[PDB]
Design a protein around this ligand. Structure first.
Ligand SMILES: Cc1cc2nc3c(=O)[nH]c(=O)nc-3n(C[C@H](O)[C@H](O)[C@H](O)COP(=O)(O)O)c2cc1C
Ligand code: SF4
Ligand code: SF4
Ligand code: SF4
Ligand code: SF4
Ligand code: SF4
Ligand code: FES
Ligand code: FES
Lengths: 107, 46, 106, 261, 410, 169, 82, 131
């Protein structure tokens, strides 16, 4: 634990959680590249609206933060070094599937 | 604006001039039941 | 020249400004043409780099020749869409003159 | 299960199975359009051409099953010239609509144009363009941006089960639009807005409202059904924009309903 | 074989005779009689026909095995099958029975162009007589083997000339040819294994089964075995169908069978063997090339199924090629992209060429863009559209260029 | 042709069954192409209702039927004239001067290409290789090749068309 | 240029042999930039010799960059130009 | 439904009949590998839902002998009956969302008009609910 070393206010090592996962493919895309490699998104908090101009004014210190990884164990251990609450999720690689142009012409 | 009409078929609308208007686009006129409004220009055709 | 506005909310002016001064919120025209609802910008954050000037495919937003508009109150800096149009109305012969004199080099 | 060489390294690939699936197994990714797993293979849109280790002419990656210790140079120069070759053809008619087309943020055709397609244009004539075919409350057909990966029909006949829409005509002028004005309503009509390769078919209700690089993409699950399908909700800052399916083998698998969408 | 299309006329060809004997209830020897005959594809494929048919030899697997003659009149310059079917249905029928037996095939559908209505009808009549004599069906002209012919009509689709496209045309699906590797040899119509053959091949097969197949081998070059019909057309004195030895030089067959060239001009000029095959410059065309297809391969050219397009310089070559490419552009379904869009592309340019409005540098790109299609489309029609143009760029460049500048003066 | 009306004659049901027999029992869809021809043989034209009718007969979805109706050239969504002229346009006839032919007929009717005569009896159409390539300029009008054409000859044959009889000459 | 890539290569080998108590690897970025690794304890001794002549009279730090990376058993990754 | 499938008759009829193997369909159900019987939630009401469940359960028993939202969550934690059939009128109902069941009847309301409504739309439940 390195909580004292980081200047981070207690609130945000406490009352919020990281949410490790390998990101899903954008489904509009047929691409696969961005899918791989663990990342460490935090939970969303409140974000209201600017009384003037209608801007999405926001309070939380660290909403936009996000971090890539090569391995999940490294990620969990990472947050543990930070003393972080976490929600590890499985890599969900698609099952391989059989394909056949001629099966379309059975009968 | 008056609706421009041409006896041909497909036409190209650049929004007026070359390289000062919207990207060149061709507005089809397959259906005479409706005008051919330009995507960017907003100018109808038939 | 038709009197129609040029902007078509391809919204990449938002997507290329380094200061991200721009904020856009398009909704469909009743006619069904793409349009902005609240194009806005704030000179408080804009750095006058002229990336927006380059970026627009329909050449809508333009970095105008006017260089003086120092003002009393911060809230005035944060231009609304209507304000930009009024600036486009005030200067149009002028701007069209510059672009006319310049575009070949682009 | 047969040994097969992806460009260099040996791979003990499953018997049969398409060359595409082989390189997918090594993880290298062939450029694609018309093919789609959870759909069906087809020979159109020959953007997947790849070069055999020895046989002089390239073959569609999703066509030929691998066998007998094949080697395949995905990065081979002749393959690359092939891909540029095709891409110029696809771009020979797709209308200059990127700024307005609502697919503009992530249309696969753009990225394929970047990664592979030659940058100079060298078409110098006149694009064909065609009238719209109105279809229902939802989908905003535009066509013209159509590239005849039949895909959507292979969606309809093979999953929605409706075969109302289909290809029509020959050569250029052939159209994936259904003949006759009749509206196509179905419960899986919404998912095509996902499936459609380009902006030729995009959701009217969400149209114009937002751009892909903007929205944050939260993961969760549907509630309109107790079926509990996984999803990617997408919000442009403090407000939901659009829903998309998130693939999951036990349930939705890349699909989603429609009332939920 | 031109005279009397009825069975009475087949008697001039000697009818069936010992055909019942040919049915020894096993292809095999006749199959060998085919393989030894050295016959190759008359569809312009040129594939070893006996080898081609041997592929179906495998013990049934229980799915009924079929046969489908590729009868069509789509290619330009090609009117070979017309007078044939109009004047000798029966030998074609006998070939259907013999070769259908060669597959052991249950049946023989035969697709036609729908334009051939009247003789699809007369064919239907002669086939009806074939049922009347007990020649076909149960037992079928002796030997006791059942076999079942049919003849489908078409409807204005030259793409159906391609075999897999035709198979796909049969089920009521559009003439959109299947992707490889499944084959009619593997999965043809419906789901059952099938096969396809040019009218020449099937009509002449029983004659291989009577007169020696080695006798077939005797003619032409050994790798260009046998004989073939030769249409002659274009600037020619007496245009006509003429079957002939494969090895025959072209100036020979023209200046003999065809009534000769109209002058020494065209001898200097291009003359196209078939259509999809490229035109060739030389005053020494035939003087070099021999009509047997391999000799044309020496000339970087296909046989084109032996249709012949004589072309005098009274006519500009460019107008002809352009109109040809128009003929392609109207027809190619377009399911595979490079064809669908590239062919139209080439037409769009050729228009500028006949206009002569094009800048010269374009031609290289054209020749370049042709390369892009040249191997890629899923079926040969795109390739067939591709080649001739490459030949034209290979050759008659100055005509093009000078046409360009002379327009450029304006 | 507002989705109405159409129905087959009984003799036609007879014929279509007689040819539907020609296909293996597992898949009747193969019957689609010939059947349309008969409708074409009947109406002389193809109202959409007829397509729906055939579709209902073979149980196949109407859309596949439309695919077939459109994909081919011989079918005719627009009404044809009592004599639907159709004529070679591919190069070998051009080498044999098909131009003088088409120009002769055009000089006659005054029709320009695909437009019908107002009398609605003739419909000129330039046509891709008829496959009768061996022979001189050629024309066919509803399944009837005419050959060794001379521009006056065709005119004479339009005359004989008005005489109500034709050979195949 | 091939030449520079050669000289840097050989020189990398040269130092690799002169003092291999710690040079984990002497990768040459293909655009002519040599860059050896060091065990963290080994910093002073290497750099020391790096000023000291043999050819390594690489005087003056250009910089002391500190690339970060969340992964890895130890995240921070220090770098010394010379 | 889009695909070919056998159509049956009426509840107790075809159900209890196949359950007693009166239906020929019961036979094909017998020879079938890993049989799946699916019963919709809609059937569970229909006046006598329990009877329908009993019939389908018997079919399950037969196969084995031969051999060869706001719903499933509550039953994961036993909130049955779940149905409003306990009543016995009980004052002060507490809607989580009366937009659904508020369409039914407000019969307890004359006895007690009060209804806390913890919804997220003004639909149905809100207008007929205090607090
Ligand atoms: C009348 C006719 C038209 C043909 N048209 C085409 C065509 O348009 N495209 C094509 O690729 N092949 C075409 N072919 C060739 C077929 O694809 C097939 O390979 C051939 O007919 C069979 O050759 P074989 O008779 O030598 O076995 C045609 C063949 C015939 C007889
Ligand atoms: S570029 Fe100019 S016009 Fe196109 S969207 Fe951004 S601002 Fe609106
Ligand atoms: S001015 Fe320069 S910085 Fe401010 S928005 Fe336009 S481009 Fe981006
Ligand atoms: S979506 Fe269609 S139009 Fe918009 S960019 Fe991608 S390709 Fe060009
Ligand atoms: S519909 Fe969607 S898939 Fe079918 S062609 Fe048009 S774009 Fe490609
Ligand atoms: S390849 Fe090109 S031409 Fe041959 S069939 Fe497929 S599309 Fe038609
Ligand atoms: S997917 Fe291989 S051809 Fe389009
Ligand atoms: S050449 Fe034109 S029809 Fe035969």
């Amino acid at each position: 634990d390195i909580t004292t070393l980081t200047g981070v206010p207690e609130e945000h090592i406490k009352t919020r959680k990281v949410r490790i996962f390998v990101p899903a493919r954008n489904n509009m895309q047929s691409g696969v590249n961005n899918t791989k490699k663990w990342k460490m998104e935090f939970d969303t908090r409140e974000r209201w609206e600017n009384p003037l101009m209608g801007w999405s004014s926001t309070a939380d210190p660290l909403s936009n933060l996000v971090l890539t990884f090569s391995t999940k164990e490294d990620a969990v251990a990472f947050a543990e070094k930070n003393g972080w609450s976490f929600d590890v999720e499985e890599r969900k690689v698609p099952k391989p599937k059989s394909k056949s142009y001629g099966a379309n012409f059975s009968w | 604006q008056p609706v421009s009409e041409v006896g041909s078929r497909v036409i190209s609308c650049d929004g007026g001039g070359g390289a000062l208007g919207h990207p060149r686009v061709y507005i089809n006129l397959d259906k005479e039941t409706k005008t051919g409004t330009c995507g960017y220009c907003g100018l109808q055709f038939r | 020249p038709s009197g129609e506005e040029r902007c078509i909310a391809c919204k990449l002016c938002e997507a290329v400004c380094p200061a991200q001064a721009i904020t856009i919120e398009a909704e469909p025209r009743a006619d069904g043409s793409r349009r902005t609802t609240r194009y806005d910008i704030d000179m408080t954050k804009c750095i006058y780099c002229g990336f927006c000037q380059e970026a627009c495919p329909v050449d809508a937003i333009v970095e105008g020749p006017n260089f003086e508009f120092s003002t009393e109150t911060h809230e005035e800096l944060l231009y609304n869409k209507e304000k930009l149009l009024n600036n486009g109305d005030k200067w149009e012969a002028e701007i069209a003159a510059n672009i006319q004199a310049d575009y070949l080099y682009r | 299960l047969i040994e097969v060489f992806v460009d260099g390294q040996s791979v003990m690939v499953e018997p049969g199975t398409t060359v595409l699936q082989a390189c997918e197994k090594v993880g290298m990714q062939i450029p694609r359009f018309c093919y789609h797993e959870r759909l069906s293979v087809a020979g159109n849109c020959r953007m997947c051409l790849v070069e055999i280790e020895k046989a002089p002419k390239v073959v569609a990656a999703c066509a030929m099953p691998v066998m007998k210790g094949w080697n395949i140079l995905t990065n081979s120069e002749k393959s690359k010239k092939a891909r540029e070759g095709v891409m110029e053809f696809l771009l020979a008619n797709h209308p200059l609509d990127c700024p307005i087309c609502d697919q503009g943020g992530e249309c696969d055709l753009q990225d394929q144009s970047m990664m592979f397609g030659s940058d100079r244009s060298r078409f110098l004539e006149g694009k064909r363009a065609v009238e719209d075919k109105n279809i229902g409350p939802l989908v905003k057909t535009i066509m013209t941006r159509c590239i005849q990966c039949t895909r959507c029909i292979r969606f309809a006949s093979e999953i929605a089960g409706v075969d109302d829409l289909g290809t029509t005509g020959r050569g250029n002028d052939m159209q994936v639009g259904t003949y006759i004005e009749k509206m196509f309503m179905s419960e899986l009509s919404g998912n095509i807005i996902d499936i459609c390769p380009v902006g030729a078919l995009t959701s009217k209700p969400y149209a114009f409202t937002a751009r892909p690089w903007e929205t944050r993409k939260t993961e969760s699950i549907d509630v309109m059904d107790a079926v509990g399908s996984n999803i990617v909700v997408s919000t442009r800052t403090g407000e939901v924009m659009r829903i998309l399916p998130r693939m999951h083998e036990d349930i939705n698998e890349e699909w989603i309903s429609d009332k939920t969408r | 074989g031109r005279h009397d299309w009825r069975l009475k006329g087949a008697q001039s060809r000697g009818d069936w005779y010992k055909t019942k004997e040919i049915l020894l209830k096993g292809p095999d020897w006749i199959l060998g009689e085919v393989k030894t005959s050295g016959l190759r594809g008359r569809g312009g494929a040129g594939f070893p026909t006996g080898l081609k048919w041997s592929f179906m030899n495998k013990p049934s697997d229980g799915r009924p095995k079929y046969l489908v003659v590729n009868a069509d009149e789509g290619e330009p310059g090609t009117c070979k099958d017309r007078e044939i079917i109009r004047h000798d249905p029966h030998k074609l029928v006998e070939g259907c029975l013999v070769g259908g037996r060669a597959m052991g095939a249950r049946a023989a559908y035969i697709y036609i162009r729908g334009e051939f209505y009247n003789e699809a009808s007369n064919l239907q009549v002669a086939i009806r007589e074939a049922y009347e004599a007990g020649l076909i069906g149960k037992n079928a002209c002796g030997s006791g083997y059942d076999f079942d012919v049919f003849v489908v009509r078409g409807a204005g689709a030259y793409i159906c000339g391609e075999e897999t496209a035709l198979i796909e045309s049969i089920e009521g699906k559009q003439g959109k040819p299947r992707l490889k590797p499944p084959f009619p040899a593997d999965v043809g119509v419906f789901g059952c294994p099938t096969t396809v053959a040019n009218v020449e091949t099937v009509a002449v097969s029983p004659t291989i089964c009577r007169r020696g197949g080695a006798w077939f081998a005797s003619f032409g070059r050994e790798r260009n075995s046998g004989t073939k019909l030769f249409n002659i057309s274009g600037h020619v004195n007496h245009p006509c169908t003429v079957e002939e030895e494969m090895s025959v030089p072209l100036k020979e067959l023209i200046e003999k069978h065809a009534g000769g060239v109209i002058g020494g001009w065209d001898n200097l000029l291009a003359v196209i063997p078939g259509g999809s095959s490229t035109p060739l410059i030389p005053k020494s065309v035939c003087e070099t090339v021999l009509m047997d297809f391999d000799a044309l391969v020496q000339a970087q050219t296909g046989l084109g199924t032996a249709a012949v397009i004589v072309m005098d310089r009274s006519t500009d070559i460019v107008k002809a090629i352009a109109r040809l490419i128009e003929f392609y552009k109207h027809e190619s379904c377009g399911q595979c992209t490079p064809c669908r869009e590239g062919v139209d592309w080439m037409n769009k340019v050729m228009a500028r060429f006949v206009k002569g409005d094009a800048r010269p540098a374009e031609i290289d790109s054209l020749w370049e863009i042709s390369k892009q299609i040249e191997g890629h489309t899923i079926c040969a029609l795109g390739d067939g559209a591709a080649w001739p143009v490459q030949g034209l760029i290979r050759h008659f460049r100055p005509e093009l260029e000078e046409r360009m500048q002379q327009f450029a003066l304006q | 042709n507002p989705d109405t009306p159409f129905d087959f004659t009984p003799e036609n049901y007879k014929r279509i069954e007689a040819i539907v027999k020609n296909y293996p029992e597992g898949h009747k869809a193969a019957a689609v192409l010939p059947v349309l021809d008969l409708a074409q043989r009947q109406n002389g034209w193809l109202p959409i209702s007829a397509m729906n009718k055939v579709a209902e007969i073979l149980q196949v979805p109407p859309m596949r039927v439309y695919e077939v109706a459109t994909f081919y050239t011989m079918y005719n969504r627009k009404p044809v004239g009592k004599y639907h002229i159709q004529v070679c346009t591919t190069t070998p006839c051009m080498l044999r001067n098909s131009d003088s032919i088409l120009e002769a007929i055009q000089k006659k009717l005054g029709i320009k290409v695909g437009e019908t005569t107002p009398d609605k009896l003739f419909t000129l159409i330039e046509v891709e290789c008829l496959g009768a390539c061996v022979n001189a300029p050629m024309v066919q009008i509803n399944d009837n090749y005419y050959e060794d054409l001379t521009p006056k000859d065709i005119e004479e044959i339009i005359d004989e068309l008005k005489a109500g009889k034709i050979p195949k000459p | 240029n091939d030449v520079v890539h050669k000289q840097l290569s050989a020189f990398g080998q040269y130092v690799a042999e002169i003092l291999p108590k710690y040079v984990q690897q002497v990768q040459v970025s293909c655009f002519n930039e040599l860059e050896i690794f060091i065990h963290p304890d080994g910093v002073i001794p290497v750099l020391t010799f790096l000023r000291d002549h043999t050819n390594a009279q690489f005087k003056s730090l250009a910089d002391l960059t500190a690339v970060d990376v969340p992964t890895r058993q130890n995240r921070f990754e220090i770098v010394y130009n010379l | 439904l889009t695909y070919r499938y056998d159509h049956l008759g009426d509840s107790p009829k075809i159900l209890q009949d196949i359950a007693s193997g009166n239906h020929p369909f019961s036979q094909i159900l017998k020879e079938a590998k890993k049989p799946m019987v699916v019963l919709g939630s809609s059937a569970l009401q229909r006046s006598d839902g329990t009877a329908i469940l009993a019939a389908v359960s018997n079919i399950a028993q037969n196969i084995r002998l031969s051999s060869g939202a706001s719903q499933v969550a509550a039953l994961d934690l036993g909130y049955k009956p779940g149905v409003e059939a306990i009543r016995k009128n009980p004052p002060k109902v507490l809607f989580l969302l009366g937009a659904d069941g508020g369409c039914i009847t407000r019969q307890d309301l004359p006895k007690d008009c009060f209804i806390i409504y913890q919804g997220h739309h003004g639909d149905v439940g809100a207008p007929m609910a205090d607090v």
